[PDB]
Design a binder for these strands. Sequence first.
RNA 1: UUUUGUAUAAUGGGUCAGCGACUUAUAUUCUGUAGCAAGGUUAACCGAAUAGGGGAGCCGAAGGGAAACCGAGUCUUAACU
RNA 2: AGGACCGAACCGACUAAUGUUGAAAAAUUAGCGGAUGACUUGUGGCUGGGGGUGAAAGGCCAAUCAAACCGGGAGAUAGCU
RNA 3: GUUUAUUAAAAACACAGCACUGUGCAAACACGAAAGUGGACGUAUACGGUGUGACGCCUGCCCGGUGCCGGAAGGUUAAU
RNA 4: AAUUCCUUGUCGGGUAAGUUCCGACCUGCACGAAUGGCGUAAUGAUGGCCAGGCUGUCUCCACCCGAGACUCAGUGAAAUUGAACUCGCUGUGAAGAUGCAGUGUACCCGCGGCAAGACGGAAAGACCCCGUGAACCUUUACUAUAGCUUGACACUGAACA
RNA 5: CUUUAAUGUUUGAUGUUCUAACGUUGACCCGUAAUCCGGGUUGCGGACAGUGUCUGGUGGGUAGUUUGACUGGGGCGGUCUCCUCCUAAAGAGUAACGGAGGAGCACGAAGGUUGGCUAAUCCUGGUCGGACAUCAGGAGGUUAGUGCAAUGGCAUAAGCCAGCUUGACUGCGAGCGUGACGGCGCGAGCAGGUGCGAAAGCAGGUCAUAGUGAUCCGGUGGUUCUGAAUGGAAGGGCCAUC
Lengths: 50, 64, 48, 79
Amino acid sequence: GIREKIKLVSSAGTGHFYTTTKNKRTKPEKLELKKFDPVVRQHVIYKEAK
Amino acid sequence: PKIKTVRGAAKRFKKTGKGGFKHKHANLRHILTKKATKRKRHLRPKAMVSKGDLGLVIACLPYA
Amino acid sequence: GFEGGQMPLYRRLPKFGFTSRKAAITAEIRLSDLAKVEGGVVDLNTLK
Amino acid sequence: GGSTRNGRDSEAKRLGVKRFGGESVLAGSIIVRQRGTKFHAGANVGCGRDHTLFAKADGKVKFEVKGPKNRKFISIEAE
RNA sequence: UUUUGUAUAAUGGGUCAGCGACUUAUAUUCUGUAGCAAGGUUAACCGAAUAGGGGAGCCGAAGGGAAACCGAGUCUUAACU
RNA sequence: AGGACCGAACCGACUAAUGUUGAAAAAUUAGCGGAUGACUUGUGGCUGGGGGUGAAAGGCCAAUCAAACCGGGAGAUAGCU
RNA sequence: GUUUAUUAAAAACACAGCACUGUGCAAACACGAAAGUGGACGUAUACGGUGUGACGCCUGCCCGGUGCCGGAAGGUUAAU
RNA sequence: AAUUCCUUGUCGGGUAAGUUCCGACCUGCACGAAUGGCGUAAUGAUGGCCAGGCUGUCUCCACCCGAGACUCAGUGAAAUUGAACUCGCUGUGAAGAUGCAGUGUACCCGCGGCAAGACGGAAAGACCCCGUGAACCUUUACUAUAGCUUGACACUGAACA
RNA sequence: CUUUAAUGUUUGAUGUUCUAACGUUGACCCGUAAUCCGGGUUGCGGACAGUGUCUGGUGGGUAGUUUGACUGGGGCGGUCUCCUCCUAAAGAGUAACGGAGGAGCACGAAGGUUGGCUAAUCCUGGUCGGACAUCAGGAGGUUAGUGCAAUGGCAUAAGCCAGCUUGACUGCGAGCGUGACGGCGCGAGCAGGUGCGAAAGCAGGUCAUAGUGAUCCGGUGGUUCUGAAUGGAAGGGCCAUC
């Protein structure tokens, strides 16, 4: 949507990534979240756009 | 003259030992950013052609 | 393959798009054959 | 207009009636909310987030009067 | 001949004679019958028989797998459940 | 002197009439309009079928026409009578 | 004066004329890819295209659209 | 009004009455000045109206004449034809029934003349709608293309800035 | 190397000159007491024009082709997918242009969890003062709420909130409800890596149901699965997402 998508990279050095629709139009402070990495099986931060 | 093989079907099906046909299943090639995890896991299992349509597939692959 | 709408029979399934290219030249020989060892030793030369 | 559309099916399914099952599973109903009319009580179990009861047992269904919070429930048969 | 329907305000026939439409080549699938059977079968040609020669090809006896590859096993796969 | 007056031939085809398996595949009669004129016309030649020729009507082109006639693709194709 | 020959002869069509416009002659232009021919063996008082239609008295507003002519710098922009 | 829906508007002229006509009024659903705007000599086998004339158009037709018709002797078709020993009325009804149900009338058969019909004849209706049929008309729908036009290159190069 | 100049020298832009390609529908000469033609003599135009290949525009002048289905008959209107109640017969599907209304997007939070918590509406009373309006007390109650229309669970709250958490999981699966199929919808339970918690247990996103659908070519990164005589690499598939 007009809220756009953000693509964040794994803090495990993997090429596999995470993508979400997180809206900034009311809440603009950056998304920087932990998720399960399916290539190393760890719980890591996904950070920094593109 | 002799009957032909449907080339657009031979690219999509593989024969089995018991004379049936395998296919990789559909609906897994588009919009995976909208298709649910559980839905993608129900489309990922590999399958064979069913008895109601199989009689038409052997008529498209007569020499397989 | 025509069913009336619904896309004809085969075009519903995605292609495999890739083949062995050796599945028609691999060859099988049964263990009950070649019992005289082609006069000495069974090799691609003596099979040829 | 003139009334429009009126949608298809509105599917809703009912299995928890008489001595149902007896092989490996006994069932309730598909009615979008279920907690006491065709539900489990005591040691019986078979329902999650989807509100369709499917209890994994060779026991047939049994009907009996009342249970916790005065709701009806359904029970299992011994043989 | 059309129809759920017809005394029919339905098409439509003057009649007798001679004509007038679903077939099997190349393939193929199943059923029947017969020759053979983990084997079954020669195409063209030669041709002497509407039979005898001629075994390039064809089908079938093992599967599992995108495939590499393995095989009475094998893909999934951490896979060892 | 006349795309002038009137009026047969001749040509036109405005009105009336007969005809309709006709005498005629629109012809024959009377009135009417024109009648050296942008008139009327004999013989030849030139132009043709998605092509001709039109003071135009998408009119007419050897009885056939908003694609004639003849021979082929071709027993075209027709979820249709 | 012309016309749907065979249901329309007219208010439509045609016209001296009137207007708008093309054309310097190997004219413009046509049919043909061309071969030629016609325009024309004429030459801007000549020829081509189109509209308008005796004459008299007159004839307001509009360059947003669609086509043309001129201005020629610059923009979008091909082969290279 | 060769233009105006309600609307057969209004008044003057007019007719026995005028949704006629002419003129006036502007009281013209978007008449309007080069397709002009409006008059207008001449032309009209010319629409809308009037008068004057003249009549078988009419009141309403009467008689007279030929040639058909009629009748006869000869020549001799076509559309059509399942079959016919098919007459009223009332009622059923693919509903608009000769033939069915109820109930009348008619000894039997020709000819002149005539249309009430047989949903008469007359070319597999012509409107409408339907076919994943076709042809044409249009255009800033798509896609080409005859023609016109731009640059570059080569045929076609020596000299100058 | 910079400033300079000249020499040799490849190739563009623009303008100028010459003559020799090309031109002559310029003159006159001959075949030929010819109209077309060919070549010459002789001038003039002149590397343009012409002719071709590539190329940008312009081109209904001409030509090929498309432009749906529903409807107590069309048009006008309303309809085509998904989704909900009543009508709809106490098993179960269910007609009608019957009675009536929505979706086509959002949410790191309303997601995971241990614990803690519990309305609406009506009434009484208000203040410096009200265009709207405070926090209590009285009545009352699966009448509030759940991201969103609609209905029903609901305090064990699935309603909101504090702490942490991000499972908005990876490989699977007793399998199962639905449909002719495509397709959708649900899942016991196993294991990988973990989160809340005393722990069990729950978490496979949200209370349940709409927010999007195939095959194809293609985007992106990964890949000894493949790769075409041998070795790469282009190409193919697989995995992950767009």
